[PDB]
Structure 1
Amino acid sequence: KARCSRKALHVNFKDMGWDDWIIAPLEYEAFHCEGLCEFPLASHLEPTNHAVIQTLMNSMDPESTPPTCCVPTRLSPISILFIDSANNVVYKQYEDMVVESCGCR
């Protein structure tokens, strides 16, 4: 049973076809969240009361109530230097780029 957790996800701007317009970085690690959210939901999964209720109900009748979902619950920024502006250079900090933690919601 592989339970909800942070997995590696490497973003490379060239593979995305974005090397024409992003100057830096070339690549970063964004991570992603994947895995079962089953009864019981341990502490690092930090469930809402709703996620607890729904999980319980899904545990009782999975035909009638689907599982809650493993998703990012804490993230951090990445700053990107790019062009795109009729090629006027620009520096921008983007929030919520890198998963720091996952949980069931």
Structure 2
Amino acid sequence: KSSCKRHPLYVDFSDVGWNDWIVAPPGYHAFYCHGECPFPLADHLNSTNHAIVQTLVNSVNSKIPKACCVPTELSAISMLYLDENEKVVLKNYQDMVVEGCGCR
């Protein structure tokens, strides 16, 4: 059973059928987070006091879930999409790309 880390994911807008409202780009690397949050949580997993405390509670009381591997740093990407009015606008989309993961 492998540990919480970042993984590749390329989102292709034509494959999910958004190529009709997103003029650019054609897709992007979004990545994703997945993997076990064991005990102890090692330095590179950027846990929080709470996730750490709850990983301990988990092992006495399994009815309490383990912390979860999620994105801990995200970044933006600009896109060109459609208007209600049929007009392309350009907007910077926040938190689109996973830059790092952690057990939270």
TM bucket, shorter chain: over 0.9
Contact 1:83 1:90 survives alignment (8 Å) = yes
Aligned amino acid, residue 24 of structure 1: A
Q: Provide structure 2 residue ranges, at least 5 long, that are not aligned to the other structure.
A: none
Matches within 5 A, 1:43-82: 43-62=43-62, 64-82=63-81
Identical aligned pairs, as a percentage?
Answer: 58
Matches within 5 A, 1:1-105: 1-62=1-62, 64-105=63-104
| Partners of 1:21 and 1:29 in 2: CA distance | 19
Q: Provide structure 1 residue ranges, at least 5 long, that are not aligned to the other structure.
A: none
- Find runs of 4+ consecutive structure 1 residues off by over 2 angstroms: none
Give the TM-score normalised by structure 1.
0.94
| Partners of 1:10 and 1:22 in 2: CA distance | 16
Aligned amino acid, residue 22 of structure 1: I
Aligned amino acid, residue 55 of structure 1: T
Q: Secondary structure at the match of 2:101?
A: strand
Contact 2:23 2:88 survives alignment (8 Å) = no
Aligned amino acid, residue 19 of structure 1: N
Over aligned residue pairs, what C-alpha RMSD do you find?
Answer: 1.0
The count of corresponding residues between Structure 1 and Structure 2 is 104
Q: Deviations over 1:23-71 (max 9, x none)?
A: 1100100000000001011112111111001001112232x21111000
